[PDB]
PDB file of C-alpha atoms (C1' of nucleotides) in Angstrom:
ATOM      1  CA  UNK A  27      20.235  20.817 -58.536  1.00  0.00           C
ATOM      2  CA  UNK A  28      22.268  17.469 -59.051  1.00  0.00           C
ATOM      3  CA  UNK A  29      23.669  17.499 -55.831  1.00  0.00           C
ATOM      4  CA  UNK A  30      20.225  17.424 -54.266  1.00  0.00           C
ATOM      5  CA  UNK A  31      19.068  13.776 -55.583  1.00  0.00           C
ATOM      6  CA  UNK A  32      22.094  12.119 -54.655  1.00  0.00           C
ATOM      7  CA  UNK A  33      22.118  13.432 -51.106  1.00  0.00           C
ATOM      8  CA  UNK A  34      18.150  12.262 -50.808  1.00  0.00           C
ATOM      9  CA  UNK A  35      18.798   8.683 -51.790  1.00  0.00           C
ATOM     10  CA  UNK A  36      21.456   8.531 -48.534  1.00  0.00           C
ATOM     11  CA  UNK A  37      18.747   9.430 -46.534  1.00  0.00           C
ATOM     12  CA  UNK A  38      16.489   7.399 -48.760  1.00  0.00           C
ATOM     13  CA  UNK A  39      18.373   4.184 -48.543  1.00  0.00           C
ATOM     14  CA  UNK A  40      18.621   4.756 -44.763  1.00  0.00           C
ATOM     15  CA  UNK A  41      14.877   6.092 -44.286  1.00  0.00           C
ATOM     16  CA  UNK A  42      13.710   3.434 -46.600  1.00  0.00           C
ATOM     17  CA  UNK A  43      13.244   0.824 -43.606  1.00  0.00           C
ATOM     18  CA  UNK A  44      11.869   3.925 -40.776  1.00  0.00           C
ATOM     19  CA  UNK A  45       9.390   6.588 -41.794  1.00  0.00           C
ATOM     20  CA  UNK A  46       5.891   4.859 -43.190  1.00  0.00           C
ATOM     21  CA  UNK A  47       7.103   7.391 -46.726  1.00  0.00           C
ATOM     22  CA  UNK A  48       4.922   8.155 -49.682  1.00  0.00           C
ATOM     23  CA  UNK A  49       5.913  11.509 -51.605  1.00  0.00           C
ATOM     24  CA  UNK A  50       4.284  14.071 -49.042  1.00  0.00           C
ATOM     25  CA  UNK A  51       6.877  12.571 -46.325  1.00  0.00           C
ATOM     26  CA  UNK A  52       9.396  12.568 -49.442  1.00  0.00           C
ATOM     27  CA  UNK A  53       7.976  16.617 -49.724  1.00  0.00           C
ATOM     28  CA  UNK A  54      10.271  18.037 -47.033  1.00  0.00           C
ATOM     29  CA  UNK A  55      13.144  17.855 -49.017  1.00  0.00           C
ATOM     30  CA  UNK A  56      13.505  21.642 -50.113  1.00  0.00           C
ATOM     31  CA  UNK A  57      10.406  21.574 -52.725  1.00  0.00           C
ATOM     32  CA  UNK A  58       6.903  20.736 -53.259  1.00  0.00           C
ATOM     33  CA  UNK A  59       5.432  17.008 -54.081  1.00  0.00           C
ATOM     34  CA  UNK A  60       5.537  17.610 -57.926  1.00  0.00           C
ATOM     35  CA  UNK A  61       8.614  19.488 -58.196  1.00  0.00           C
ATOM     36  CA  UNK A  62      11.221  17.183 -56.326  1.00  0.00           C
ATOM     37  CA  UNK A  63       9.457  14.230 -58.073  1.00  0.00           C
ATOM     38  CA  UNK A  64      10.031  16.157 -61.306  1.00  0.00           C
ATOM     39  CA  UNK A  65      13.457  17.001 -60.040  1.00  0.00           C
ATOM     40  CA  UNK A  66      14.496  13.149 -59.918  1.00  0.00           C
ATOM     41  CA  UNK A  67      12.617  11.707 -63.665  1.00  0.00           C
ATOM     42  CA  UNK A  68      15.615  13.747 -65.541  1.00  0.00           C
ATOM     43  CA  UNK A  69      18.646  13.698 -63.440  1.00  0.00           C
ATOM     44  CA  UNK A  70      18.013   9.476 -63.087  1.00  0.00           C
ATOM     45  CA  UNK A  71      16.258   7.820 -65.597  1.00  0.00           C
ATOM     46  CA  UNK A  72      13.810   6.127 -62.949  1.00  0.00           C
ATOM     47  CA  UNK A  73      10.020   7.403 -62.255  1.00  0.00           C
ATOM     48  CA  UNK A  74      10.639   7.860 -58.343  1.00  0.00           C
ATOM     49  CA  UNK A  75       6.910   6.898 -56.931  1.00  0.00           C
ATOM     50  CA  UNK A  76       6.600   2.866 -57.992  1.00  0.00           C
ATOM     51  CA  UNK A  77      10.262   2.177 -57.862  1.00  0.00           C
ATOM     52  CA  UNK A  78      10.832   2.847 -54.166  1.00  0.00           C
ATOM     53  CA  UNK A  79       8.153   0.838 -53.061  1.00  0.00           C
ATOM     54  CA  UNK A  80       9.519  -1.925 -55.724  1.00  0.00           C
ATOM     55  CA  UNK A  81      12.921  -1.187 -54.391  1.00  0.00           C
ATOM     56  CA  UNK A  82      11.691  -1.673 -50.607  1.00  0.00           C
ATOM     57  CA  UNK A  83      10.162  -4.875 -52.167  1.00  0.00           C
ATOM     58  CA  UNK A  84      13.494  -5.645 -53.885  1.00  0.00           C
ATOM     59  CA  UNK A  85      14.714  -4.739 -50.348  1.00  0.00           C
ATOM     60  CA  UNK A  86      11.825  -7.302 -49.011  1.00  0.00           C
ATOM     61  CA  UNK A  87      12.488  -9.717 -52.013  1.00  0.00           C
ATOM     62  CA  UNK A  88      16.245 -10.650 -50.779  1.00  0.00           C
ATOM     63  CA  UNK A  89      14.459 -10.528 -47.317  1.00  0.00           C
ATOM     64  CA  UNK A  90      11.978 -12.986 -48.557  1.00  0.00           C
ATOM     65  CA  UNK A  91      14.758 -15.326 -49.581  1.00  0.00           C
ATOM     66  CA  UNK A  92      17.494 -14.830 -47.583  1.00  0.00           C
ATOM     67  CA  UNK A  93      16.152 -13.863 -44.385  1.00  0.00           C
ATOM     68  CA  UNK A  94      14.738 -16.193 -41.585  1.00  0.00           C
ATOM     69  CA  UNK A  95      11.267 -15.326 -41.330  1.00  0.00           C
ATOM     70  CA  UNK A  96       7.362 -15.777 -42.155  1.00  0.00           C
ATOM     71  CA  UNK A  97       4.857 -14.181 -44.736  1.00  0.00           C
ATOM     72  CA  UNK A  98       3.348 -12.278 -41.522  1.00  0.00           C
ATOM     73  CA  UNK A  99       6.856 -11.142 -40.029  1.00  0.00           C
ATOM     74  CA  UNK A 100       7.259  -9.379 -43.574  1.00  0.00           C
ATOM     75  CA  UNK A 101       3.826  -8.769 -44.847  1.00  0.00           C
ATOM     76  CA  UNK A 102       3.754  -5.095 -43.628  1.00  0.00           C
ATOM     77  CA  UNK A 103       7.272  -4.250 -42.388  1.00  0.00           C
ATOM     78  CA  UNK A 104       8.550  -3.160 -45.408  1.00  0.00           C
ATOM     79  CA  UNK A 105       5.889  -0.432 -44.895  1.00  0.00           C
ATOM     80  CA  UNK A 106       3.273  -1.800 -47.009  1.00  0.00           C
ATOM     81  CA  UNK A 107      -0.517  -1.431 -46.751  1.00  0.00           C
ATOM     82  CA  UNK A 108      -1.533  -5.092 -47.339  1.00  0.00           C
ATOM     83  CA  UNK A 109      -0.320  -8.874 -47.938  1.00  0.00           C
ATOM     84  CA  UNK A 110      -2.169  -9.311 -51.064  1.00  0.00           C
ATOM     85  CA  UNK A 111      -1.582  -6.334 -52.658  1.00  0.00           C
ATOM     86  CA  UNK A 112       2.281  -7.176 -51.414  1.00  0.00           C
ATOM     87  CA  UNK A 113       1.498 -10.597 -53.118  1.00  0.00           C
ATOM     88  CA  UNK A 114      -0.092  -8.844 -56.239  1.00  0.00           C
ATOM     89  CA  UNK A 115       2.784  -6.784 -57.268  1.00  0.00           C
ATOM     90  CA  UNK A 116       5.049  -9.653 -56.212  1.00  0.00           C
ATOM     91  CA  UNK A 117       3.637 -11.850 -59.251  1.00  0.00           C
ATOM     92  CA  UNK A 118       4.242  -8.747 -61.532  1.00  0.00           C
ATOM     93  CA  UNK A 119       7.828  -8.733 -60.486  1.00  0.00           C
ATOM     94  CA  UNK A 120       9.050 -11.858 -60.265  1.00  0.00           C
ATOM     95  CA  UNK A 121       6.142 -14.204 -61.744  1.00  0.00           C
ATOM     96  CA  UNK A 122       6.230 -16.293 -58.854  1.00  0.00           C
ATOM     97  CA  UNK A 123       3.964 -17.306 -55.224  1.00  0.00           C
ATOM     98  CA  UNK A 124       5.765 -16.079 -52.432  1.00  0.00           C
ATOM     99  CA  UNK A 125       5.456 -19.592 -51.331  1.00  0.00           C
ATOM    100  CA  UNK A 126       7.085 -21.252 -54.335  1.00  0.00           C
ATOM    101  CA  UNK A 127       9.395 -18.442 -54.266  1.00  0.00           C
ATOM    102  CA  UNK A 128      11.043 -20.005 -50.933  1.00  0.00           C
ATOM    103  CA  UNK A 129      10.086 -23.688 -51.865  1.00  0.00           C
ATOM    104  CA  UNK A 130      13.212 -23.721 -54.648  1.00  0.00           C
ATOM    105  CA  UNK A 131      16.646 -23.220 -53.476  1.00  0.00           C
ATOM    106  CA  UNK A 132      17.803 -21.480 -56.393  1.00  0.00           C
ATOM    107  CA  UNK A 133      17.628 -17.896 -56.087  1.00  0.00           C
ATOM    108  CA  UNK A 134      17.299 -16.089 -59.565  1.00  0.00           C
ATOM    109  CA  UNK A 135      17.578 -12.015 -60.097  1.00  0.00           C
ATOM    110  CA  UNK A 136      14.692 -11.109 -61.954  1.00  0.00           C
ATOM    111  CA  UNK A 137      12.701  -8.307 -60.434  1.00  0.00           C
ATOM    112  CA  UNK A 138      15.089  -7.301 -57.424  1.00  0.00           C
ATOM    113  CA  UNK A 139      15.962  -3.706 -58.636  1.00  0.00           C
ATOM    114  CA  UNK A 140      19.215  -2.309 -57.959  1.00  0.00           C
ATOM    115  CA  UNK A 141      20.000   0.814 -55.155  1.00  0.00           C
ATOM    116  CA  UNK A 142      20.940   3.757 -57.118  1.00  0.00           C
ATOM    117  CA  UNK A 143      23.320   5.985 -56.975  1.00  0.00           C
ATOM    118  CA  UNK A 144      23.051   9.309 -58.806  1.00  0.00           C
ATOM    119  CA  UNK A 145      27.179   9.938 -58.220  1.00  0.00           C
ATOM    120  CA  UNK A 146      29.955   7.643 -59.021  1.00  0.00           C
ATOM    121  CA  UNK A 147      29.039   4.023 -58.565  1.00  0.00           C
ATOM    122  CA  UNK A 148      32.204   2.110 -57.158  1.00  0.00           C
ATOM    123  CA  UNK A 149      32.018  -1.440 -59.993  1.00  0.00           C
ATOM    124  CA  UNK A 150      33.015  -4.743 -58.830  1.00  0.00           C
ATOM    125  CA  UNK A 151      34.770  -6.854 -61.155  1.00  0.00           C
ATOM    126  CA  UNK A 152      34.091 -10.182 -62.828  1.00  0.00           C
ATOM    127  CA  UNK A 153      36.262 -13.666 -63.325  1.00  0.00           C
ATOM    128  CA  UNK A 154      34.144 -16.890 -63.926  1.00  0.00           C
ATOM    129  CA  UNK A 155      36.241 -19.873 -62.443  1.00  0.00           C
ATOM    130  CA  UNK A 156      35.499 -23.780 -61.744  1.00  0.00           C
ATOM    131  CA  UNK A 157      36.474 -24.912 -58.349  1.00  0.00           C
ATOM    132  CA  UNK A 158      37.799 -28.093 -56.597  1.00  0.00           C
ATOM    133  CA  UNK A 159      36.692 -30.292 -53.871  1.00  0.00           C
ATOM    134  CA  UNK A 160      38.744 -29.155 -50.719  1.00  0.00           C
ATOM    135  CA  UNK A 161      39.067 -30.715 -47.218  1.00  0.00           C
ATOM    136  CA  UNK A 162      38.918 -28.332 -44.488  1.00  0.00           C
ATOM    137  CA  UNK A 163      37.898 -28.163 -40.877  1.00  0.00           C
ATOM    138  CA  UNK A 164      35.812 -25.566 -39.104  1.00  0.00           C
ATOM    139  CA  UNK A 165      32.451 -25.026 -36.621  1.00  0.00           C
ATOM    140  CA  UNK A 166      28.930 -23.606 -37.319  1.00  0.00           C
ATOM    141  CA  UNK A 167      26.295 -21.593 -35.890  1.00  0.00           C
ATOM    142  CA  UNK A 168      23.335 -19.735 -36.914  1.00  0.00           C
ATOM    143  CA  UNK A 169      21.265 -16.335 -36.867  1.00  0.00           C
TER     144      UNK A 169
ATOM    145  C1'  DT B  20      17.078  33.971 -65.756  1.00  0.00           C
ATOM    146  C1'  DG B  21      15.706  29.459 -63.713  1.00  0.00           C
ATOM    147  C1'  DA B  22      14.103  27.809 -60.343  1.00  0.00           C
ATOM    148  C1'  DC B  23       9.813  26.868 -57.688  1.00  0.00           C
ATOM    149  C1'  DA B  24       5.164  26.329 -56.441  1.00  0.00           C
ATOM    150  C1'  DG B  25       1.041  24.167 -57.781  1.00  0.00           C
ATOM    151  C1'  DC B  26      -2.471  22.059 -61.292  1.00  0.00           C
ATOM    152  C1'  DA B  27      -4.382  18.351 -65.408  1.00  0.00           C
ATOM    153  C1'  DC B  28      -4.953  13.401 -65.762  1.00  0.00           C
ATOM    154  C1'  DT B  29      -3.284   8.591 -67.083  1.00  0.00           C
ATOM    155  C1'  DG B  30      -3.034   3.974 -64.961  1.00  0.00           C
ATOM    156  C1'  DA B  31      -0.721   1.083 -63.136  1.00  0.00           C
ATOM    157  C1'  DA B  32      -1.684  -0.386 -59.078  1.00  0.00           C
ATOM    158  C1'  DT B  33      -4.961  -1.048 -54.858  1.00  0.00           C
ATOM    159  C1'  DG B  34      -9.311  -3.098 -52.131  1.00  0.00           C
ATOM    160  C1'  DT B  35     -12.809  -5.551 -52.491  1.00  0.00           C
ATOM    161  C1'  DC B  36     -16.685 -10.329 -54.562  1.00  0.00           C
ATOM    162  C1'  DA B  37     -15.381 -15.303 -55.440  1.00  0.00           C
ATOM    163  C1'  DA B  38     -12.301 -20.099 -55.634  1.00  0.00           C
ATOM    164  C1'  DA B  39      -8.000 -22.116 -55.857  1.00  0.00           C
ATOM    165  C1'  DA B  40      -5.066 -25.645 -53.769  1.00  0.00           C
ATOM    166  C1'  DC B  41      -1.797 -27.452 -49.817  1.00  0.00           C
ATOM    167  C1'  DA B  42      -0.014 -29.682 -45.724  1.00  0.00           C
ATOM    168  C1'  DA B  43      -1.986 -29.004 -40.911  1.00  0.00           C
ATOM    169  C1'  DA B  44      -2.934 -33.095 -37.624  1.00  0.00           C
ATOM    170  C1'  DA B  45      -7.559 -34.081 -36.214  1.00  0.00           C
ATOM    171  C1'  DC B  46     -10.503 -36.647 -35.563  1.00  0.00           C
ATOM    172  C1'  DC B  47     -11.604 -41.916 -37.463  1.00  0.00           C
ATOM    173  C1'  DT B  48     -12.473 -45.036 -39.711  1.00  0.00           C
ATOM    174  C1'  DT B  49      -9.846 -49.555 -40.048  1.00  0.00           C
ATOM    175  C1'  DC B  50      -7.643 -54.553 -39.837  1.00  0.00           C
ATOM    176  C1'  DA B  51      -4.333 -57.979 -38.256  1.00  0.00           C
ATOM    177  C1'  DC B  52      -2.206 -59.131 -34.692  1.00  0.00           C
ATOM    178  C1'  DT B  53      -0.700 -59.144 -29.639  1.00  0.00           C
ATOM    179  C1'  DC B  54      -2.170 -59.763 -25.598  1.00  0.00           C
ATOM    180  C1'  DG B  55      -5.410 -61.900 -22.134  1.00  0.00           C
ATOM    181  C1'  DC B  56      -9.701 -65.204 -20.230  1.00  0.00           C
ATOM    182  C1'  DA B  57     -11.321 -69.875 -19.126  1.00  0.00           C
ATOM    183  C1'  DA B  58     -11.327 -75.006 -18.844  1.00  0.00           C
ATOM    184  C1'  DC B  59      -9.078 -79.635 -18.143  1.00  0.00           C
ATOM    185  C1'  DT B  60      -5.636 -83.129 -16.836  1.00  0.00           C
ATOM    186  C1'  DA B  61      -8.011 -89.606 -13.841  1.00  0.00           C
ATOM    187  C1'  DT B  62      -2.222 -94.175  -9.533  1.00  0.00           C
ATOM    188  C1'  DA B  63      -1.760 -92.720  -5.364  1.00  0.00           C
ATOM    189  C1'  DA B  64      -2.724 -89.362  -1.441  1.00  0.00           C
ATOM    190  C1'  DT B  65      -7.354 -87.244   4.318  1.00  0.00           C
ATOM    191  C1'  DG B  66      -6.377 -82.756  10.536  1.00  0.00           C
ATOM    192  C1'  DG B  67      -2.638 -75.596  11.864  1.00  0.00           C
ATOM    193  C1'  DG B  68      -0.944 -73.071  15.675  1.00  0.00           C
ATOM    194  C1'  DA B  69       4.688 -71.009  12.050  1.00  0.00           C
ATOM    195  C1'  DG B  70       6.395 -68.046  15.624  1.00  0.00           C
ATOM    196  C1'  DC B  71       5.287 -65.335  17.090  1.00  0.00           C
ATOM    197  C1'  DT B  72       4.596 -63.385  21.859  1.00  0.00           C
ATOM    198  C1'  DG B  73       7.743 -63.713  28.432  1.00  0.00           C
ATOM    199  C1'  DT B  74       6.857 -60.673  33.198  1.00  0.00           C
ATOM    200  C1'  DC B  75       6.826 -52.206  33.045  1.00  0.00           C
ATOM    201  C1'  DA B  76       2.766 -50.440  36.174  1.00  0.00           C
ATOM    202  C1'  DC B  77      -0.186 -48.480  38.960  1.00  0.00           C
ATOM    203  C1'  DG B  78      -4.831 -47.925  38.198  1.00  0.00           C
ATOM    204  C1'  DG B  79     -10.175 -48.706  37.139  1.00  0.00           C
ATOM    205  C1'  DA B  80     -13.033 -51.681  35.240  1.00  0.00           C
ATOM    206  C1'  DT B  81     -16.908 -55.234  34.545  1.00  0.00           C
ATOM    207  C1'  DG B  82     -18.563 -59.230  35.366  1.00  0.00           C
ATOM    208  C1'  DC B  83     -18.724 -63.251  37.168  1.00  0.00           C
ATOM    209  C1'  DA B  84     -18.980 -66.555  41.305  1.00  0.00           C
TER     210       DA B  84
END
DNA sequence: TGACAGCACTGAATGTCAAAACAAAACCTTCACTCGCAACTATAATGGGAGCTGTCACGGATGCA
């Protein structure tokens, strides 16, 4: 029913770092392969299969631009099966080498896909200002 | 009744033959200069000890004489 889906994306979004998943690990969840996957194409509007390992790449993607590491740190650790099938897909996402994607420092959304939510999705709000040149005084360290 | 389990097949999306380029310094030319050899200079000059080391002590030694 609907609240299946909803409760198999908060394991999802927690299990999509842990268990090596394709749909037959995805199976255990109260039905067959087919018939959970045909469970989520109505009740969501995404096709389950490709988007999660898109999503784990848009989960990799702000890991490939945000986070501190190499191509080889993060060519299989979002679960994948190889770096240039992970660089493949990556050009039909976001049109882009993986090195030029970290060479430019500005950061555009193009192919990172969102997490969803099948219940009530809690909106942030908006309001475009233009800011000032402030003195301060503070310390810095890193991670 | 509607779930509920499994099949039919597209195909986008993999797993392989190739290069495509980029910094990697790595080994390597370079090419001007800094950094080193070597020789000469023509009034006249001509013999150390460089400070040192001072009585221990019985004992065996070899060779001189």
């Amino acid at each position: 029913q609907a609240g299946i889906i909803r409760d198999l994306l908060i394991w999802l979004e927690g299990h999509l770092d842990q268990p090596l998943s394709l749909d037959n690990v995805a199976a255990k969840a109260g039905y067959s392969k087919w018939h959970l996957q045909r469970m989520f194409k109505d009740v969501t509007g995404h096709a389950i299969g490709a988007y999660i390992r898109a999503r784990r790449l848009s989960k990799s993607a702000v890991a490939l631009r945000l986070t501190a590491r190499p191509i080889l740190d993060i060519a299989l650790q979002y679960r994948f099966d190889s770096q240039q099938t992970f660089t493949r897909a990556f050009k039909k996402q976001f049109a882009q080498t993986p090195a030029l994607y970290r060479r430019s420092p500005e950061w555009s959304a193009f192919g990172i896909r969102p997490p969803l939510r099948l219940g009530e999705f809690t909106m942030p709000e908006h309001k475009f200002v233009t800011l000032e040149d402030t003195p301060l005084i503070g310390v810095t360290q890193s991670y």
